[PDB]
C-alpha cells in the first residue's frame, strides 16, 4: 500500500532485467558494476601493445558471468530479443506498419516528413541521402536509453496485469527482426545500424508513448472508482479511442497526426454548447471582462438561451469541413497502408457534438475531455525538412477602391504614432546619442566573429561568435560608415536561416540578423517594448488608451496558468457573453509592403518629428530608419538555407559537359551530385526512372524575401498593432452593415490572435449568418484570410493562448513530453536536473496526470540518470583512483554507478533530491525529514527510507560554482565608451580611484569592474566550460574519497543566512478548530492528493504574497537589463551591510551609480533601503524551493491572510525570522491537509522556564551577532535589531 516499497521493488525488477545477474539490493545507497569493451584495446594495438586475455573476456562472462575485476563483477546489457521475455502476438498493427514500407524508387527529395523506406545491403547515393536524412531527423535525445523504457514498460505491464498495444507491436517486431538499432548509453545521440527501416526509432518511441498513455488513463480512471468514460450518458472506452487513433497513424505518423490535430480540438471546444439545460459554475469579478479578481461559489443548472441558434449555416459548415478533413485523413491512411480501418467511435461521437450535454462536475466527462487533448504526443517532435520558397510577388493584394488595404495601412500608421505619445506619458523615450554605446548591451550569436586569448591557471586560442563577446571586443566596428551602408542582396552578401524543433508542429524558421541592422531598430523601438512590457489595463473599446488592449504581458506574468487565466473561466461561466475568436492563416506571409510595412515606416518617421535636432555620430534619425529597415537591410534581403533538389539519371549526368558539373561555392548534401546552375539542373532532370539527385552550387538557389521577419526587434509589437487595426475595421464594418446587432465589451490582441467579448441581441439564424458573413468579408478585404473551420463564435467556451475553459471550469491539456527533447542534453549538474524534472512532473500532475505514475517515473529516472558518466575512475580495493595508462587489467573497463530509487526522497544537502512521498509539491528538507519521522501516521511510508538515508554518495557536478583560474590575456577594449558617467568620471583621475578603493564596493569597483564583466562573459560560453571542466574527474574522485556516511541537521545555515530549520528553535503544537466548509475551485480533474489540498485550503484570492528582502532587491534589480547578469541581490546586501546604519539616501544613490547601476534603479534601491532602516535585521533567507512550483502558487498559502488565520508566533521576532516561520507553517499545513489530519492552528509555544529561555537567547545572539563578524569589526552596535536583543526573552 506504501508507494515506497512497491516502487522500490518495481525498479529493482527493472534493473535486474536490464542487467542480468546483477545484485541490486534496496538496502544500500548504490551498486557498482564494471563494463568491458574491446574498442580501446584494438586501437592500442596500433602502437604495439599485447595482452594475455585475447578474446577470452567475452566468452568468460556472456554466458558464464565470471569476469570479476578486483571483486566487482563485469556484466553486459540484455539483447533486444529478450527484452520482452520472448513473448509474441498477432497484432494487426505490425502488419499495417510492415505493409507501409516503401522501396527507394518512390523517393521525394523535398518531402516534409520521411515515410517508411527500406534498408538494403547495397548502398547507392539514394540510400545515402536517406541515411543522411534519418540521422538528423530520427533522433530521440532525452535522458534515458529507450531500452530502459521498454524494460520498465514490460515490468509495469506485468505488475498491473494489463498489456498495452505498443508493447505488442514492439514484441512482434523484435520476435522476428531482432536488434532494430544501436544507441549509446554514454551519449544518447549516437543512433546507428538501422535494420529493417529508417523509421524504427520513431516506431519504438511512438509505441512507448502509447503504452505510457494507456497506463496513465487506466490508473487515473482507477483512482475515481469508475469503469468507463461517458459522452453525456453514453459509455465510451478510452483505450479503444487511443488504439484506433494509434493504428491509423502508422503509415505516416507525423503527417497524419499534424492533419488530425485540428478536428479533435474543434470537437472538444464545441462539445455541449447547445444543450437546452446547461450546467455552469458561478463566478464573480469586476466590471471589466479581463478582471482577475474572481471567486467561485457553487454549481447550478439553467436553461440555454442560444438553443435555437445552432441550426445556422456557419455551424453546419464548421461541422462539415471538420468531418471532411477526417475523411481525407482516413482515405490517405487507407491508401498508403493496405487496410480498410477507420475511426468509427470518433465519427459516431462528432455527429451530435452541439446538442450532447457536457458535465463539468462529473469526472467521467472532464477526464474524457482532457484525454482527447493529450493523445497527440505519441509521434514526438515534429522534425522535418523545410525548403526555401521565395516571396511570390505577383499575387499579393494591392490597394483598390473595392479593398481595405489603404485603411489598414493608415490605421497602422495612426496606432504607431499614438504609441509613442503614450510611451512618453510614462517617461519612456528613444535612446539619446549619449546612451548609444551603453544601449548596445540590451541586444546567443551574431553575424560577426572574434578571436581571443585565454590562460590556463590551476595560453590557448579559441573562436567565438557570441553577442556579448563580440560586442565587448569590437563594438566600435559596428556603428561605422562602411558597415552601415552594406547591402545584403547579392551572391557575395547574404544571411542564413536557422531551424528549431517544436514538440508537435513543423520546424520553426529562425532569421538571424546582423548586429548592424539590430542596433538601429533598437534605437527607435526600445520605448515601445518598455511601454508594452507592463501588465494590466482597461480593454473596453470606448477607452482611449491602447496600452491595455495589447496583452503581450498578461500571460506568464505570475507563475501559474490557472491564476493568469481566470477571466477565461469567468466569461465562459456567464450566459450574457458571446465570444468571437479568429485565427489567421500564414499571418506573417500576408504582411506585405502594401498593407503593413509602408504605414509602419511612415508612422515611425512622423513620430520622430520633434527629435530632428539630434545627431547620432553625424547621422540623422531618418538615416537610422534607413539603416534599420532599408532596402538591402530588411526589405529585399537575400537569404540562404536548405538546397533545392532534382531527380535525374546518371547516364545523362555523365553525358553532360564538365563545365556544367562545376563544384561551386555552396555545399551540397552527401547523396547528391554537384551541378553548376539551376537552369541546367532543370534541363536534364526527369521524374520516371530516376537514380541520381542533383543540386545547384553557384548561388541561384537563394530565395528573395520581402515579408515581416520573426527575427526583428519589434516583431510582436508590430504584429499586435496590425491585428488591432484589423479588429478596428472589423468593428466599424459590422457596425455599419448590421447596426445594433453586436455590442463590443472587450478587445484583446497578442499578435496573430484576436479575442472579443460581445453581447448578441438576436436569435434569428439569418441575422447571425449575415453578421458572420460580414466579419469574414471584412477580414478577406484587408489582405488576410481566415479559415471558417477554425474560427470560434460560441458562448460557454473561451480559449486564449493554449488555455481552455468550458462552462466555467478548467479543461487542461498535457503536451509535456518526457521521453524525448528538442536537442541533446548534457547533464553538468545532476541534482539541478533532477530538481527540474520533479518540477516538470508537478506541472504534469497539475495538468491532470497521475500522481503515482509520476512518482514511479521519477523513481525510474533517479537511478539511471547518473550512470555511465564515469569512464576514467577505477574502483580498486574500495579506493577511487585514476587508472594506469596501459595494463592487462584496467584497459578496456569502465565503472557503472546505479543509485537507489529511494534517493528521490532524501533531502538536498544529504546528496539526495528533495521530494516528499506524501505529495510531490512538498519539498523535503532536513527538518522536514525530522518532522516526518516524528509523525506516527507516516511510519509505514518512511520505514524504507530510514535505512539508506545516510548512505547516498555525492552527485556529479562539474559546474561546481566557484570556477576560478581561467584568466584571459586579451583585454576588453570597449569599456571606455560604454561606461556610465559615474564610472567615466571616476576613471578620469587616479586620486578618485584611490579614494574609492576605501569604499567597500570591492569586486565591482570601477578599477576592476571590466575584468569581472569579461570573466562573467567568458564563462557563459559552452566550449570554454567544456575546456575548463576537463579535469573535474579528479575532484570527483577526491569527493568520493573524503565522503563519510553520516548526516546531521543544523539550525543556522551560514553566517548571516538562515533557513526553515530556524523554526526548530521552538516547540510547535496544533490546537483550535477552524472552518470545515470545503472550498470551490475551477480546476477539477486532479489526483486525490492535490484535490484534498485544494479542498481543505482554498484557491488564492489575494493578489499579492509576502516577500523577503532578497526577493524585493532582486525584483528591483531586474529593471537594469544591462547590469542584470552581473550584480545579484547578495552583492547589494553585502554592500549595504558593509555600510553602517548612519547613512544618507544620496550616498546610497551615488555609490550604487558608482557600481555602474542605472540611476533610476539606484534611486529605487536607495528609497527602499531608507524606508526599511529601522526594521532591517541584516539577514538573508535561504529558500530551498518552497512554494515556488506551479500548483502551490495556486493555493491560499504564503499570504498575509494565511498567516493571520493559521499562525500564532511571539511578537519579539524580526522580519526574516517571521519569513522562515511562515514558510515552515505553509509546508506543515500542506502536509497535514495531504495526510488527512484535522484542520488546526499552529502555535509557537515558549514557557516561563529560565533554562529554555536562556538557550533561545544564546542561539538568537549567535545568529544575530556571529563571532566572525565581531572579529572582522563588521557589526554595528547601534542597529535597532541589535539593541532590542537586550530584553527580548528575559
Amino acid at each position: 500500500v506504501a508507494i515506497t516499497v512497491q516502487g522500490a521493488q518495481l525498479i529493482k525488477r527493472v534493473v535486474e532485467r536490464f542487467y542480468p545477474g546483477i545484485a541490486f539490493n534496496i538496502n544500500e545507497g548504490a551498486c557498482y558494476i564494471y563494463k568491458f569493451s574491446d574498442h580501446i584495446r584494438r586501437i592500442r594495438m596500433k602502437h604495439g601493445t599485447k595482452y594475455r586475455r585475447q578474446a577470452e573476456e567475452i566468452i568468460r562472462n556472456i554466458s558464464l558471468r565470471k569476469e570479476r575485476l578486483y571483486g566487482i563483477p563485469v556484466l553486459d546489457e540484455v539483447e533486444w530479443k529478450y527484452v520482452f521475455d520472448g513473448q509474441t502476438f498477432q497484432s494487426y498493427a505490425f502488419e499495417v506498419y510492415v505493409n507501409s514500407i516503401l522501396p527507394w524508387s518512390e523517393l521525394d527529395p523535398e518531402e516534409e516528413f520521411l515515410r517508411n523506406y527500406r534498408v538494403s545491403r547495397e548502398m547507392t547515393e539514394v540510400e545515402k541521402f536517406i541515411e543522411f536524412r534519418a540521422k538528423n531527423e530520427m533522433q530521440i535525445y532525452g535522458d534515458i536509453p529507450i531500452k530502459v523504457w521498454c524494460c520498465f514498460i514490460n515490468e509495469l505491464s506485468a505488475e498491473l496485469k494489463h498489456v498495452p498495444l505498443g508493447m505488442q507491436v514492439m514484441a512482434d517486431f523484435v520476435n522476428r527482426f531482432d536488434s532494430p538499432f544501436h544507441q549509446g548509453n554514454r551519449d544518447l545521440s549516437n543512433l546507428e545500424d538501422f535494420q529493417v527501416a529508417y523509421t524504427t526509432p520513431l516506431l519504438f518511441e511512438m509505441c512507448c508513448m502509447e503504452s505510457i498513455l494507456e497506463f496513465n488513463i487506466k490508473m487515473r480512471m482507477r483512482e475515481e472508482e469508475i469503469s468507463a468514460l461517458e459522452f453525456g450518458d453514453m459509455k465510451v472506452d478510452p483505450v479503444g479511442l487511443l488504439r484506433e487513433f494509434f493504428i491509423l497513424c502508422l503509415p505516416h505518423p507525423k503527417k497524419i497526426n499534424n492533419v488530425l490535430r485540428a478536428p479533435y480540438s474543434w470537437f472538444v471546444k464545441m462539445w455541449g454548447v447547445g444543450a437546452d439545460p446547461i450546467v455552469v459554475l458561478q463566478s464573480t469579478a469586476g466590471d471589466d471582462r479581463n478582471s482577475k479578481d474572481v471567486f467561485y461559489d457553487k454549481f447550478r443548472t439553467e436553461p440555454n438561451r442560444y438553443k435555437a441558434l445552432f441550426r445556422s449555416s456557419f455551424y453546419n459548415e464548421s461541422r462539415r469541413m471538420n468531418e471532411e478533413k477526417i475523411l481525407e485523413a482516413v482515405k490517405y491512411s487507407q491508401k498508403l497502408g493496405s487496410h480498410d480501418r477507420r475511426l468509427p467511435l470518433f465519427e459516431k461521437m462528432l455527429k451530435t457534438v452541439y446538442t450532447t450535454p457536457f458535465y463539468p462536475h462529473k469526472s467521467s466527462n472532464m477526464i474524457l475531455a482532457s484525454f482527447l487533448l493529450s493523445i497527440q504526443t505519441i509521434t514526438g517532435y515534429g522534425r522535418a525538412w523545410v525548403k526555401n520558397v521565395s516571396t511570390e510577388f505577383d499575387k499579393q493584394l494591392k490597394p483598390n477602391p473595392s479593398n481595405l488595404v489603404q485603411d489598414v495601412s493608415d490605421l497602422t500608421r495612426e496606432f504607431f504614432k499614438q504609441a509613442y505619445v503614450e510611451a512618453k506619458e510614462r517617461r519612456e523615450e528613444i535612446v539619446k546619442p549619449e546612451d548609444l554605446y551603453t544601449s548596445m548591451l540590451r541586444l546567443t550569436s551574431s553575424g560577426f566573429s572574434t578571436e581571443i586569448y585565454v590562460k590556463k591557471r590551476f595560453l590557448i586560442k579559441i573562436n567565438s561568435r557570441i553577442k556579448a563577446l563580440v560586442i565587448f571586443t569590437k563594438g566600435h566596428t559596428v556603428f561605422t560608415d562602411e558597415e552601415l551602408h552594406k547591402k545584403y542582396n547579392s551572391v557575395e552578401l547574404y544571411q542564413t536561416k536557422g531551424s528549431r524543433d517544436v514538440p508537435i508542429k513543423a520546424t520553426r524558421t529562425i532569421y538571424s540578423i546582423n548586429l548592424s541592422v539590430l542596433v538601429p531598430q533598437l534605437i527607435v523601438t526600445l520605448p515601445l517594448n518598455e511601454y508594452f512590457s507592463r501588465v494590466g489595463g482597461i480593454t473596453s473599446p470606448d477607452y482611449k488608451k491602447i496600452g491595455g488592449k495589447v496583452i503581450v504581458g498578461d500571460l506568464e506574468a505570475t507563475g501559474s496558468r490557472v491564476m493568469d487565466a481566470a477571466d477565461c473561466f469567468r466569461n465562459s461561466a456567464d450566459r450574457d457573453i458571446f465570444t468571437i475568436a479568429i485565427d489567421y492563416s500564414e499571418y506573417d506571409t500576408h504582411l506585405t509592403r502594401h498593407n503593413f510595412r509602408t504605414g509602419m515606416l511612415q508612422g515611425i518617421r512622423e513620430a520622430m518629428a520633434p527629435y530632428r535636432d539630434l545627431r547620432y555620430e553625424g547621422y540623422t534619425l531618418e538615416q537610422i530608419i534607413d539603416f534599420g529597415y532599408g532596402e538591402g537591410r530588411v526589405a529585399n534581403t537575400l537569404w540562404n538555407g536548405k538546397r533545392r533538389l532534382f531527380k535525374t539519371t546518371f547516364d545523362a549526368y555523365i553525358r553532360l559537359d564538365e563545365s556544367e558539373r562545376d563544384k561551386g561555392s555552396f555545399k551540397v548534401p552527401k547523396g547528391v551530385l554537384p551541378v553548376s546552375s539551376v537552369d541546367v539542373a532543370n534541363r536534364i532532370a526527369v521524374d520516371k526512372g530516376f537514380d541520381t539527385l542533383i543540386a545547384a552550387t553557384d548561388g541561384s538557389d537563394l530565395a528573395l524575401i520581402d515579408t515581416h521577419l520573426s527575427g526583428e526587434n519589434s516583431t510582436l509589437i508590430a504584429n499586435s498593432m496590425h491585428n488591432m487595426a484589423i479588429g478596428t475595421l472589423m468593428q466599424r464594418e459590422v457596425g455599419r452593415e448590421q447596426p445594433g446587432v453586436l455590442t463590443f465589451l472587450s478587445e484583446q490582441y497578442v499578435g496573430d490572435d484576436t479575442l472579443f467579448y460581445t453581447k448578441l441581441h438576436t436569435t434569428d439564424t439569418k441575422v447571425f449568418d449575415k453578421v458572420a458573413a460580414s466579419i469574414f468579408d471584412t477580414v478577406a478585404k484587408c489582405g488576410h484570410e481566415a479559415s471558417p473551420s477554425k474560427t470560434m463564435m460560441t458562448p460557454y467556451s473561451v480559449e486564449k493562448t493554449q488555455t481552455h475553459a468550458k462552462q466555467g471550469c478548467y479543461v487542461p491539456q498535457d503536451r509535456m513530453m518526457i521521453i524525448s527533447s528538442e536537442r541533446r542534453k548534457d547533464i553538468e549538474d545532476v541534482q539541478g536536473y533532477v530538481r527540474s524534472q520533479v518540477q516538470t512532473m508537478i506541472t504534469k500532475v497539475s495538468r491532470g496526470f497521475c500522481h503515482d505514475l509520476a512518482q514511479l517515473i521519477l523513481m525510474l529516472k533517479t537511478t539511471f540518470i547518473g550512470a555511465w558518466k564515469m569512464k576514467r575512475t577505477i574502483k580498486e580495493d574500495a579506493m577511487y583512483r585514476d587508472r594506469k595508462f596501459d595494463s592487462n587489467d584496467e584497459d578496456g573497463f569502465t565503472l557503472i554507478q546505479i543509485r537507489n530509487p529511494l534517493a528521490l526522497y532524501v533531502p538536498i544537502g544529504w546528496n539526495g533530491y528533495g521530494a516528499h512521498p506524501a505529495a510531490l509539491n512538498i519539498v523535503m528538507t532536513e527538518e522536514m525529514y525530522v518532522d516526518s519521522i516524528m509523525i506516527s501516521k507516516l511510519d509505514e511510508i518512511m520505514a524504507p527510507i530510514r535505512r539508506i538515508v545516510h548512505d547516498i554518495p555525492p552527485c556529479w557536478n562539474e559546474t561546481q560554482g566557484d570556477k576560478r583560474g581561467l584568466i584571459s590575456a586579451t583585454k576588453m577594449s570597449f569599456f571606455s565608451k560604454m561606461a556610465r558617467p559615474a564610472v567615466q568620471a571616476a576613471l578620469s583621475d587616479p586620486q578618485i580611484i584611490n579614494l574609492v578603493e576605501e569604499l567597500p564596493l570591492g569586486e565591482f569597483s570601477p578599477g576592476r569592474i571590466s575584468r569581472t564583466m569579461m570573466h562573467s562573459a567568458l564563462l557563459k560560453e559552452s566550449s570554454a566550460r567544456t575546456l575548463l571542466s576537463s579535469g573535474y574527474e579528479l575532484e570527483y574522485q577526491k569527493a568520493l574519497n573524503s565522503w563519510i556516511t553520516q548526516v546531521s541537521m543544523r539550525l543556522g545555515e551560514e553566517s548571516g543566512v538562515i533557513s526553515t530549520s530556524y523554526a526548530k528553535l521552538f516547540d510547535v503544537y496544533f490546537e483550535g478548530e477552524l472552518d470545515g466548509a470545503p472550498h470551490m475551485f475551477p480546476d477539477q480533474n486532479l489526483s486525490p492528493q492535490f484535490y484534498i489540498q485544494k479542498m481543505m485550503i482554498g484557491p488564492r484570492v489575494s493578489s499579492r504574497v509576502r516577500n523577503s528582502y532578497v526577493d524585493r532587491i532582486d525584483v528591483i534589480l531586474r529593471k537594469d537589463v544591462v547590469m542584470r547578469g552581473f550584480i545579484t541581490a547578495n552583492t547589494i546586501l553585502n554592500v549595504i551591510e558593509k555600510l553602517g546604519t548612519n547613512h544618507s539616501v544620496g550616498d546610497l544613490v551615488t555609490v550604487f551609480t558608482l557600481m555602474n547601476i542605472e540611476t533610476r534603479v539606484a534611486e529605487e534601491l536607495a528609497e527602499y533601503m531608507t524606508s526599511e532602516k529601522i526594521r532591517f535585521d541584516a539577514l538573508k533567507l535561504l529558500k530551498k524551493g518552497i512554494a515556488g512550483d506551479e500548483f502551490t502558487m495556486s493555493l491560499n498559502v504564503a499570504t498575509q491572510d494565511f498567516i493571520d488565520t493559521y499562525l500564532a508566533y511571539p511578537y519579539q521576532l524580526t522580519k526574516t525570522e517571521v519569513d522562515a516561520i511562515s514558510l515552515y507553517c505553509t509546508q506543515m499545513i500542506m502536509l497535514r491537509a495531504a495526510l488527512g489530519l484535522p484542520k488546526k492552528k499552529m502555535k509557537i509555544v515558549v514557557t516561563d522556564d529560565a533554562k529554555k529561555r536562556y538557550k533561545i537567547r544564546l542561539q538568537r545572539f549567535r545568529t544575530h551577532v556571529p563571532k566572525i563578524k565581531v572579529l572582522k569589526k563588521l557589526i554595528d552596535p547601534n542597529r535597532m535589531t541589535v539593541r532590542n536583543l537586550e530584553n527580548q526573552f528575559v
Binding site: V930, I933, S936, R946, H950, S1048, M1049, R1050, R1262, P1266
Partner: peptide, 25 residues
Amino acid sequence: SGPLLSVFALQEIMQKVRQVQADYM
C-alpha cells in the same frame, strides 16, 4: 557554533519521543 543533531541518536530515542508526546497530549 550551533548545536548538531544526530539522526542516528534520534532514531534510537524515538520511543521516548513518542512517550513524551503521549504524556503531553
